[PDB]
Amino acid sequence: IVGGYTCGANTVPYQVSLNSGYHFCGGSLINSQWVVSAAHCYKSGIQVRLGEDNINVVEGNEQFISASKSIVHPSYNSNTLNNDIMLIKLKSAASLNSRVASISLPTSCASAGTQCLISGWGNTKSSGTSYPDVLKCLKAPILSDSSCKSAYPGQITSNMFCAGYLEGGKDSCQGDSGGPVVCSGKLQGIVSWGSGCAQKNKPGVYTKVCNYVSWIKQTIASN
C-alpha cells in the first residue's frame, strides 16, 4: 500500500497473509474454513496466516493453517486478468474471535463514490521498493466505470472496477494482490492489478466480488 497508514494490530480481522515460506499475497477470510484471494496468486503449498500484524514476528494472535485445496475461477484468464478470483480451503477451521473474523459477502454491488478500505503488506513505494512488515491500510473511493475505462483503454471488463485517486500517491501495490477491498462492511473487491503503483491516471483495478457471490456460495457448498 502506497500513501496509506498503519492499520493497527488486528484491526482488519479478516485480512490474511498467504505464505509459501514468505508472504506473497493477501486474502480475505469469508468463513471459518475458506479464504477469497486473486487467481493470479495461485500456487501449491499455501499456508494461510490469520491474526497477523507484523508478518516477521510472532506476536500472539496468529493462526497458521495449511490449505487443503485451491479453486481458481473457471473462467480466469491470466493474460487479461478477467475473473481474477480464487478460493482457498483451510485444512482445519480457524478459531473465530474479535481479532480473527470473517468478512461478509456483498448483498449488492457497490457504486462509484463509495468509500472502501484496502489493506495489505505490499510495497509502500511508487518508485523503488520497501516492504512494511505491519499491515497497511488505505481509504479510497470506487471510481466511475467511465473514468476506469478512460484510464485503461481496452482493458476493463464487467468483472473489474477501479478505486483510488487519479492524482496519484495513494494505491495498492505489489504484494497486496489478493487482499480485500471492504465497503460498508462487505467484501466488494480483491486487489488485482494496475500500471505501477500510485501513478497519476493509473488507479488500482480490483476484481468485482459481487459478480461472484453465486459461484462462491455454490463452490463452498460442495467442497
Catalytic residue chosen out of the listed positions 40, 53, 70, 119: 40
Phi and psi (nearest 5°) for 219?
-65, -45
**Gyration radius of the chain over CA positions:** 16
Q: How far apart are CA 157 and CA 80, in angstroms?
A: 9
C-beta of 104: minimal distance to Ca ion in Å?
Answer: 25
Q: Is 84 a catalytic residue?
A: yes
10 Å Cβ neighbour count for 73?
20
Q: Is 23 a catalytic residue?
A: no
Is residue 59 marked as binding? no
Catalytic residue chosen out of the listed positions 53, 84, 176, 192: 84
Q: Is 40 a catalytic residue?
A: yes
- Site residues (CB under 5 A) for Ca ion, limited to 48-107: 52, 54, 59
Q: How far apart are CA 53 and CA 139, in angstroms?
A: 18
10 Å Cβ neighbour count for 112?
15
Is residue 175 marked as binding? yes
C-beta of 9: minimal distance to Ca ion in Å?
Answer: 9
Grid look-up 484491526 returns: 11
With CB under 5 A as the rule, give the number of residues binding Ca ion.
3
Give the residue numbers of the binding site for substrate. Answer: 171-172, 174-175, 177
Residue numbers at the binding site for Ca ion (CB under 5 A): 52, 54, 59
